[PDB]
């Protein structure tokens, strides 16, 4: 074969894909119909993507992985517009015909400082990584047909000869053109059913400024430096400020807004529906009195999907093509990243001893499908407790405790793998969690909360319970599980900004 990988799209998940097998030793070729500089969202970073980028560095010896997963290394190594700083995810909840009130907020915050991705930024240098390890990349090409064969790969090129590989990785950030022509992909059994408009825009206004000062909020962290997320019935919209880091030279804030199909369609053109979103919530429109939008809005009139396999003997769809959720909590880039680091080794075993079954990459399906299942069972039962406040305030404990469980969970990893240089203990200690896709990864007593609060929200929904009712069940259910989940405090409901 001319080459041993193939790789559809040379975004950030592309990228890193790319730079891991070409570091390896094996011939790596990068596809993509687009081409860079481009523009992408998918831009709050987690505990969780911090830790599976310094995996990822630390597993396959790529130093320069490791600066994606801090600001400071961003501003320094990628430059200073490729980030915003985030200290925490906010909440601020709000409700049509009533005024807004500063005390309706949540606001975790982080210990170490994560990134606000400024994309077309990020993704850039993640190819420049894959390029300076020897994977070729082609860009601003047409895949004219996909073959898969006993022995291997045909990609077929417009005005240009077919090429050959081992084995297929779809890593595009849109459409699953992999997915497409293998007929995996449907919108069947999912919970989650949104719209989402986004752009990016000059001049807003932070939380502070616009709406209420720290002296008000009482909150530990700056809602500006922070991924702010107004939420409400129907849906939610987010302010994630790339401007916000002392050191930056960015001037843009992200702004995307979702509605739950269900309860609300958009039915005119996306600037006709922020200004009718900013009148029923005053509130958010403080931000945007003198805001002016830097680019087109993007319409997606439905973003959710998932995938029924996502690996065959010659192929793999990293997450991204397989299944979508929503944005909310940006569980998108954690589950590619690990998936990474899950296929990656087993495409090594696989070139290395050229065995190409679906049996050996069973697992990395295992994964995947069962994030995207939990993704959405996350999202949906979120979606309800936009609701109200109170409610919000409950469930949003639900999620908070999973995630520090599972962002424990991959730093123990991390320093393990650090103090024994043991990269196959790693694989395996990966592979041996008992919830693999899901937000504790490895804690029985926490995933029997999660499932058990999404079976509290789903009836909710389907019986009109009230919200009240709601919340006080998922409230004694928090202190049923508390004494197994980490020791923060999150059955105290009145404290609204749960510290580490
Ligand atoms: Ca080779």
């Known amino acids: 074969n001319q080459y041993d990988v193939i790789i559809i799209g040379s975004g950030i998940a592309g990228a890193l894909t790319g730079a891991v097998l070409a570091k390896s030793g094996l011939n790596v070729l990068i596809l993509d119909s687009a081409q860079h500089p481009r523009f992408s969202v998918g831009e709050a970073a987690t505990p969780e993507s911090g830790f599976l980028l310094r995996l990822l560095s630390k597993r396959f010896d790529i130093p320069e992985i490791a600066y994606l997963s801090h600001p400071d290394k961003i501003i320094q190594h990628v430059g200073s517009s490729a980030c915003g700083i985030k200290l925490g995810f906010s909440f601020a909840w709000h409700q049509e015909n009533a005024p807004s009130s500063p005390d309706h907020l949540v606001a975790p915050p982080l210990k170490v400082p994560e990134a606000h991705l400024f994309r077309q930024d990020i993704d850039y240098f993640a190819l420049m990584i894959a390029l300076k390890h020897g994977a070729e990349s082609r860009q601003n090409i047409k895949i004219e047909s996909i073959s898969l064969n006993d022995d291997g790969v045909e990609v077929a090129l417009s005005n240009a000869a077919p090429v050959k590989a081992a084995f297929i990785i779809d890593?595009?950030?849109?459409?699953?053109?992999?997915?497409?022509?293998?007929?995996?992909?449907?919108?069947?059994?999912?919970?989650?059913?949104?719209?989402?408009?986004?752009?990016?825009?000059?001049?807003?206004?932070?939380?502070?400024?616009?709406?209420?000062?720290?002296?008000?909020?009482?909150?530990?962290?700056?809602?500006?430096?922070?991924?702010?997320?107004?939420?409400?019935?129907?849906?939610?919209?987010?302010?994630?400020?790339?401007?916000?880091?002392?050191?930056?030279?960015?001037?843009?804030?992200?702004?995307?807004?979702?509605?739950?199909?269900?309860?609300?369609?958009?039915?005119?053109?996306?600037?006709?529906?922020?200004?009718?979103?900013?009148?029923?919530?005053?509130?958010?429109?403080?931000?945007?009195?003198?805001?002016?939008?830097?680019?087109?809005?993007?319409?997606?009139?439905?973003?959710?999907?998932?995938?029924?396999?996502?690996?065959?003997?010659?192929?793999?769809?990293?997450?991204?093509?397989?299944?979508?959720?929503?944005?909310?909590?940006?569980?998108?880039?954690?589950?590619?990243?690990?998936?990474?680091?899950?296929?990656?080794?087993?495409?090594?075993?696989?070139?290395?001893?050229?065995?190409?079954?679906?049996?050996?990459?069973?697992?990395?399906?295992?994964?995947?499908?069962?994030?995207?299942?939990?993704?959405?069972?996350?999202?949906?039962?979120?979606?309800?407790?936009?609701?109200?406040?109170?409610?919000?305030?409950?469930?949003?404990?639900?999620?908070?405790?999973?995630?520090?469980?599972?962002?424990?969970?991959?730093?123990?990893?991390?320093?393990?793998?650090?103090?024994?240089?043991?990269?196959?203990?790693?694989?395996?200690?990966?592979?041996?969690?008992?919830?693999?896709?899901?937000?504790?990864?490895?804690?029985?007593?926490?995933?029997?909360?999660?499932?058990?609060?999404?079976?509290?929200?789903?009836q909710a929904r389907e019986q009109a319970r009230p919200v009240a009712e709601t919340a006080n069940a998922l409230h004694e259910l928090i202190k049923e599980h508390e004494a197994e989940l980490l020791p923060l405090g999150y059955s105290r409901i009145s404290n609204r900004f749960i510290l580490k």
């Open 171 to 458: 890593a595009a950030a849109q459409g699953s053109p992999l997915s497409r022509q293998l007929g995996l992909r449907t919108t069947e059994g999912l919970a989650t059913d949104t719209c989402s408009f986004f752009t990016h825009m000059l001049n807003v206004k932070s939380y502070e400024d616009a709406l209420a000062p720290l002296s008000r909020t009482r909150s530990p962290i700056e809602l500006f430096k922070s991924t702010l997320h107004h939420i409400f019935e129907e849906g939610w919209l987010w302010v994630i400020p790339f401007n916000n880091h002392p050191q930056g030279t960015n001037q843009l804030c992200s702004i995307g807004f979702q509605f739950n199909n269900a309860k609300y369609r958009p039915t005119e053109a996306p600037e006709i529906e922020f200004r009718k979103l900013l009148k029923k919530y005053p509130a958010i429109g403080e931000h945007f009195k003198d805001a002016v939008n830097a680019r087109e809005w993007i319409y997606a009139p439905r973003i959710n999907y998932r995938s029924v396999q996502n690996v065959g003997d010659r192929f793999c769809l990293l997450p991204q093509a397989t299944g979508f959720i929503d944005p909310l909590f940006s569980r998108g880039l954690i589950t590619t990243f690990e998936s990474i680091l899950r296929l990656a080794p087993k495409v090594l075993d696989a070139a290395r001893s050229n065995r190409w079954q679906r049996e050996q990459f069973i697992e990395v399906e295992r994964h995947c499908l069962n994030a995207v299942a939990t993704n959405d069972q996350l999202v949906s039962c979120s979606y309800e407790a936009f609701s109200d406040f109170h409610l919000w305030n409950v469930w949003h404990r639900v999620w908070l405790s999973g995630s520090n469980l599972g962002s424990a969970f991959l730093q123990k990893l991390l320093h393990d793998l650090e103090h024994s240089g043991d990269a196959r203990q790693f694989d395996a200690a990966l592979e041996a969690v008992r919830f693999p896709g899901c937000l504790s990864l490895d804690s029985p007593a926490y995933e029997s909360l999660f499932r058990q609060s999404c079976q509290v929200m789903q």
